[PDB]
Amino acid sequence: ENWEIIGSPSEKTFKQRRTFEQRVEDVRLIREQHPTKIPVIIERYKGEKQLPVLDKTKFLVPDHVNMSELIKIIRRRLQLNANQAFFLLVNGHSMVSVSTPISEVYESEKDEDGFLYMVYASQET
Amino acid sequence: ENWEIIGSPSEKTFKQRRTFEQRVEDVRLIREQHPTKIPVIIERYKGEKQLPVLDKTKFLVPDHVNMSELIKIIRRRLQLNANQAFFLLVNGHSMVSVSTPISEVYESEKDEDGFLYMVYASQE
User: Fold this and answer.
1) The architecture CATH gives domain A1-125
2) What is the side-by-side strand order in the sheet with A58-62?
3) In chain A, whose CA is at the least distance from the CA of B98?
4) Among A30, A115, B15, B53, which has the minimal tally of Cβ within 10 Å of its Cβ?
């Protein structure tokens, strides 16, 4: 009833832990050192229980890798059984084009700070 | 005997002008009557100056139509010159897959109310 619920401060995404200029600077450094790679943040959906957390959240993806290959890579790193449902959501939604290079996905879906943000869940929201 | 100045009503989008249940009900009736069409809301970006306003907002798009075809159709109805920048944004972003049927786009990008919302603008 018009009440603002304050979240548990424990859940701090990569974007919430870094300032805008810190993130912009991160992206600039990666562009210089790895010109053919896309910087991708991959995090577990907030309310996810069926899937585990990855050790790492910051990934450098070669420009040529497409979404279906990236999906396969993340499923293997989560050590998922082949029957487990899994969705890799970009700006809240599954990618329709799974055969296009991630560098092409990057140009449509990147954040203002230069990062490509992704969230995985066992449901497509 | 002074003048009563009427204020401008708030500029409300389609989603703000109808309740959730009203929109879910719209979609259900549409699906029942036009089962091979996709219900698409297309509105001009809030802060847009270079493109004009479309006559219509609510569109029924045949399943097989792709985003490239829809862009060409919207650009014609807006009567843009060939050099004007134009972007048709789905959930805030341009589609990478401009050759796939919109019925496939629908399944990944639709709203929880069953509509597919698009915004057009002269920039991304």
Assistant:
1) Roll (3.10)
2) A58-62, A37-44, A116-121, A87-90, A93-94
3) A97
4) B53
